Design an enzyme around this catalytic site. Structure first.
Site, PDB file in Angstrom:
ATOM      1  N   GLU A   1       0.782  -1.235   0.000  1.00  0.00           N
ATOM      2  CA  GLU A   1       0.000   0.000   0.000  1.00  0.00           C
ATOM      3  C   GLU A   1       0.818   1.291   0.000  1.00  0.00           C
ATOM      4  O   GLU A   1       0.558   2.199  -0.794  1.00  0.00           O
ATOM      5  CB  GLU A   1      -0.955   0.002   1.197  1.00  0.00           C
TER       6      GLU A   1
ATOM      7  N   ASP B   1      -2.223  -4.844   3.741  1.00  0.00           N
ATOM      8  CA  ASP B   1      -2.488  -5.116   5.150  1.00  0.00           C
ATOM      9  C   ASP B   1      -3.460  -6.272   5.324  1.00  0.00           C
ATOM     10  O   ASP B   1      -4.313  -6.508   4.468  1.00  0.00           O
ATOM     11  CB  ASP B   1      -3.034  -3.863   5.839  1.00  0.00           C
TER      12      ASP B   1
ATOM     13  N   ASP C   1      -5.907  -6.525   7.499  1.00  0.00           N
ATOM     14  CA  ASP C   1      -7.263  -6.119   7.878  1.00  0.00           C
ATOM     15  C   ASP C   1      -8.189  -6.161   6.660  1.00  0.00           C
ATOM     16  O   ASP C   1      -7.739  -6.427   5.547  1.00  0.00           O
ATOM     17  CB  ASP C   1      -7.258  -4.715   8.496  1.00  0.00           C
TER      18      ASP C   1
ATOM     19  N   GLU D   1      -9.757  -3.693   5.048  1.00  0.00           N
ATOM     20  CA  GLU D   1      -9.529  -2.651   4.054  1.00  0.00           C
ATOM     21  C   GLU D   1      -8.383  -3.097   3.139  1.00  0.00           C
ATOM     22  O   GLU D   1      -8.497  -3.049   1.913  1.00  0.00           O
ATOM     23  CB  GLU D   1      -9.183  -1.316   4.724  1.00  0.00           C
TER      24      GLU D   1
ATOM     25  N   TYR E   1       4.620   4.198  10.106  1.00  0.00           N
ATOM     26  CA  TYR E   1       3.323   4.746   9.605  1.00  0.00           C
ATOM     27  C   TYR E   1       2.681   5.695  10.624  1.00  0.00           C
ATOM     28  O   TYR E   1       2.668   5.353  11.824  1.00  0.00           O
ATOM     29  CB  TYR E   1       2.373   3.597   9.262  1.00  0.00           C
TER      30      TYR E   1
ATOM     31  N   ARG F   1      -0.398   6.470  10.850  1.00  0.00           N
ATOM     32  CA  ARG F   1      -1.776   6.064  11.089  1.00  0.00           C
ATOM     33  C   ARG F   1      -1.813   4.718  11.773  1.00  0.00           C
ATOM     34  O   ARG F   1      -1.581   3.687  11.151  1.00  0.00           O
ATOM     35  CB  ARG F   1      -2.513   6.013   9.758  1.00  0.00           C
TER      36      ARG F   1
ATOM     37  N   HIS G   1       0.007  -3.084  12.574  1.00  0.00           N
ATOM     38  CA  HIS G   1       1.297  -2.360  12.413  1.00  0.00           C
ATOM     39  C   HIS G   1       2.024  -2.316  13.760  1.00  0.00           C
ATOM     40  O   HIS G   1       2.381  -3.397  14.270  1.00  0.00           O
ATOM     41  CB  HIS G   1       1.063  -0.956  11.841  1.00  0.00           C
TER      42      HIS G   1
END
Ligand code: ZN
Ligand code: ZN
Ligand code: ZN
Length: 840
Positions: A8, A86, A88, A90, A294, A296, A340
């Site tokens: 990503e 990732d 998850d 999303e 990251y 976020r 993460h």
């Protein structure tokens, strides 16, 4: 052949390609790459059909064409494609979209998850891989679709019942509700008076000892008025004071957890004055330059390597007393997951002072992140706390002290200031007598709840699991742009419109407006991800409930439908017809209207007045008092206890409005005089009166008008300048078509220069200067003065094409040439009936 890996974040890719070298081709999707854009029009707009088993229409993002394209050809020289997004839902969905945009056969695709950057991870990645989880993908599609339906189906209802431009959303609307509830909480607050009494005394030695009165007759001492406070001081003045107990005890202080997105924003806001958006901008720079992880994240976790790295550093730079026997433990949430990691320096050995390639503020943010990360793994601070109990007649008094014995973690993260307990107490033993020196009574008032700050609201959202790290900042802005709340002195204030929408939504969509709606949704989404439920079935249940509410809301107020906006009149004279005037809310804000708006054309009145509010100016020097005094400052409504909020109607008049407006109809008018602004935008100075001029919007687009009510001098917006003097002399051309829109171009003049503009100017807003060849083509239409520009040299010596520009320093038109849209550095000017040309 060569293996294609896709992640990503670009920064993460560059890093992976390294710990993997050639043979492989790493790249990044840089986000989602694809997303959404009974009634057919509504379905076309939503991109999903709730009435046709949720068939959807995804389409590449208008800004990922290249990414998708460059990713296409790369799929050729690739043997096996490895989707490494990732784990998850999303990330799982981004993988699903990549696979459907690149095409090919299922077997040509593989799913891998990277633990860390360490080779001990990037290796295991391809060791035991798998494929994409359809359940996970469908879980994300379910969330995405539910958010779509709500926004595209509820907002329209608002446009009809309340005002155009309004919006509603699962996250958006509860964020506003939180601000609205705090606003009402503050406006209804009534400060309570209470008194405190302290006594200065001398020990048998002669040392000073300050005491606080805690009890009287064995009940907490808390007088509410001066009279009671006096009755008590009178007794304390004559009393004999003696020490009852001295409790010395070792106490500790513990470091906090490393940062996550929410806490970073709050810390940057409290210690550096950074706003949420700014903090994320700096954090972004730091991440892309490889200094931190990251930005976020919602997890405060630390890898073992990270933990060994920091302990290794603490050991060499502080010594044993600072290094705990074993790693500091924290966060035991049994439902907690792993994602993460926490925000921290990528290399503990890198100090903020060595980042000379970063802005000063980014270095400050890095230092904040660094210190929090190192303090987190150090030993506790140790203090010797002393508590003195004193008796005096029927009163009990107390004194507390503290002496630092070992700084521990505070060595790297100092105490900004000494606390109330960071003091020392004189030696005194039980039974010792104390000599009274003086008694100091103090009046106090309880203060109202604090107003939200950007970081403060984010904190509340994350606490209830409402938003996401990557969306918090975005949420804070949307609610402002939509006009629901406003920020002043870095604090939130609810706007009338926000209250109006919040009440309507709570009335007709209670479930959606419940704070836990997201939590409840997450449970259902997990069930889909764990084969404990089917996604279309879950959406069908949801949609059935939602449509039941929507249809009911569509009805007339008497049938339980949504209340449309409501006029509340007041004693004010309409400048056009003198009539009583009423208080109204639009997406633009809160405004004063004349009831003739509801009368047919014959008797219609469109006169309106803007309601400038009196901004609360909280005094930072008053500390905790600052909010309480603000509540004290407000008038109180006659009909109810609710506070009142204040607005300016004239340089002679001021208007008070009740907090529960329009449910409460109290209003007050006062000979109060202050200043008033016509609206807001690009500050301009009116050439006819020197007063401030602002930017306004209406049925005719954008105009500029002066705030002085005695002057109607109005400028206007133009294609390539801030503002245009009064109004000017235009010429239309039907033969020049627009390029970004279907409009046609018109030629205009002003102090800015001569420019082309699109005939639907407020809507098209299309921008360019005319070419000399264009002017030559329409030379007959040009007014007599402008002809010379058509005489100007049409092409430069390189054969490039030329455009017309205004030299502000000499107030004259000139012609210049551009190549690849950049200036060629060539110009020609008109000087005494001739055109002269040369280098710029
Ligand atoms: Zn009127
Ligand atoms: Zn009231
Ligand atoms: Zn003016």
């Amino acid at each position: 052949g060569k293996a294609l890996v896709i992640v990503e974040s670009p920064a993460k890719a560059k890093t992976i390609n390294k710990y993997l070298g050639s043979d492989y081709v790493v790249k990044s999707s840089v986000g989602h790459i694809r997303d959404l854009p009974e009634r057919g029009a509504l379905v076309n707009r939503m991109g999903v059909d709730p009435w046709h088993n949720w068939e959807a229409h995804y389409e590449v993002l208008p800004g990922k064409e290249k990414v998708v394209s460059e990713l296409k050809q790369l799929a050729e020289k690739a043997d096996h494609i490895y989707l490494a997004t990732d784990l998850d839902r999303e990330g799982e969905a981004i993988a699903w979209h990549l696979r459907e945009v690149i095409g090919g056969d299922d077997a040509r695709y593989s799913r891998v998850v990277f633990n860390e950057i360490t080779k001990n991870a990037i290796r295991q990645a391809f060791n035991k891989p798998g494929e994409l989880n359809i359940d996970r993908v469908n879980a994300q599609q379910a969330r995405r679709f539910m958010d779509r339906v709500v926004g595209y189906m509820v907002s329209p209802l608002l446009w009809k019942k309340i005002a155009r431009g309004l919006s509603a959303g699962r996250v958006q609307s509860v964020a506003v509700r939180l601000v609205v509830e705090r606003e009402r909480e503050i406006k209804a607050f009534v400060p309570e008076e209470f008194w405190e009494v302290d006594a200065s005394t001398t020990t048998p030695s002669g040392e000073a000892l300050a005491l606080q009165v805690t009890h009287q007759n064995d009940k907490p001492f808390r007088p509410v008025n001066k009279e009671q406070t006096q009755a008590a001081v009178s007794l304390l003045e004559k009393a004999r004071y003696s020490v009852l107990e001295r409790e010395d005890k070792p106490t500790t202080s513990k470091p906090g957890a490393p940062f996550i997105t929410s806490t970073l924003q709050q810390a940057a806001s409290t210690r550096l004055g950074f706003g949420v958006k700014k903090t994320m901008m700096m954090a972004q720079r730091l991440y892309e330059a490889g200094y931190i992880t990251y930005m976020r994240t919602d997890s405060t976790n630390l890898s073992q390597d990270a933990v060994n790295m920091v302990r290794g550093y603490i050991s060499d730079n502080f010594g044993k007393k600072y290094l705990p026997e074993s790693p500091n433990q924290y966060a035991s949430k049994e439902n907690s997951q792993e994602a993460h990691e926490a925000i921290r320096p990528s290399d503990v050995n890198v100090m903020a002072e060595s980042l000379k390639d970063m802005e000063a503020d980014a270095q400050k943010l890095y230092q904040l992140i660094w210190r929090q990360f190192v303090a987190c793994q150090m030993t506790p601070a140790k203090y010797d706390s002393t508590t003195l109990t004193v008796g005096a007649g029927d009163f009990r008094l107390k004194a507390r002290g503290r002496i630092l014995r070992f700084d521990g973690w505070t060595k790297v993260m100092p105490a900004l200031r000494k606390g109330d307990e960071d003091r020392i107490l004189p030696a005194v033993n039980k039974g010792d007598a104390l000599t009274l020196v003086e008694l100091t009574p103090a009046q106090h008032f309880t203060k109202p709840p604090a107003r939200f700050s950007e970081a403060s609201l984010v904190k509340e959202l994350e606490k209830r699991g409402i938003g996401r790290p990557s969306t918090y900042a975005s949420i804070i802005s949307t609610i402002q742009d939509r006009g629901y709340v406003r920020v002043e002195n870095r604090r939130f204030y609810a706007e009338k419109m926000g209250e109006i929408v919040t009440d309507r939504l709570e009335e007709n969509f209670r479930e959606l407006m419940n704070y836990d709606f997201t939590a409840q949704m997450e449970n259902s989404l997990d069930q889909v991800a764990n084969h404990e439920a089917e996604w279309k079935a879950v959406l069908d249940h949801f949609f059935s409930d939602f449509t039941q509410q929507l249809d009911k809301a569509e009805k007339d107020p008497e049938e339980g439908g949504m209340r449309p906006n409501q006029m509340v009149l007041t004693s004010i004279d309409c400048p056009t017809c003198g009539r009583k005037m009423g208080i109204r809310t639009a997406s633009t804000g809160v405004f004063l209207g004349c009831s003739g708006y509801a009368l047919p054309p014959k008797e219609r009145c469109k006169t309106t007045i803007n309601l400038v509010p009196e901004n609360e100016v909280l005094n930072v020097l008053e500390g905790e008092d600052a909010e309480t005094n603000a509540l004290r400052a407000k008038r109180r409504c006659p009909k109810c206890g609710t506070a009142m909020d204040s607005y300016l109607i004239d340089p002679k008049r001021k208007l008070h409005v009740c907090g529960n407006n329009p449910t409460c109809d109290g209003y007050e008018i006062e000979e109060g005089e202050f200043r008033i602004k016509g609206y807001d935008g690009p500050i301009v100075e009116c050439e006819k009166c020197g007063s401030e001029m602002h930017l306004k919007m209406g049925r005719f687009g954008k105009y500029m008008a002066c705030t002085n009510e005695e002057c109607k001098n109005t400028r206007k917006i133009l294609r390539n300048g801030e503002v245009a003097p009064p109004k000017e002399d235009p010429v239309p051309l039907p033969e020049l078509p627009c390029e970004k829109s279907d409009a046609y171009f018109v030629l205009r003049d002003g102090a800015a220069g001569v420019f082309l503009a699109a005939n639907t100017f407020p809507k098209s807003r299309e921008t360019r200067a005319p070419l000399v060849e264009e002017l030559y083509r329409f030379r007959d239409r040009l007014p007599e003065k402008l002809r010379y520009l058509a005489d100007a040299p049409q092409q430069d010596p390189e054969g490039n094409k030329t455009m017309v520009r205004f030299s502000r320093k000499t107030k004259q038109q000139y012609v210049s040439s551009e190549k690849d849209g950049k200036a060629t550095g060539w110009s020609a000017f008109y000087v005494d009936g001739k055109w002269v040309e040369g280098k710029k």
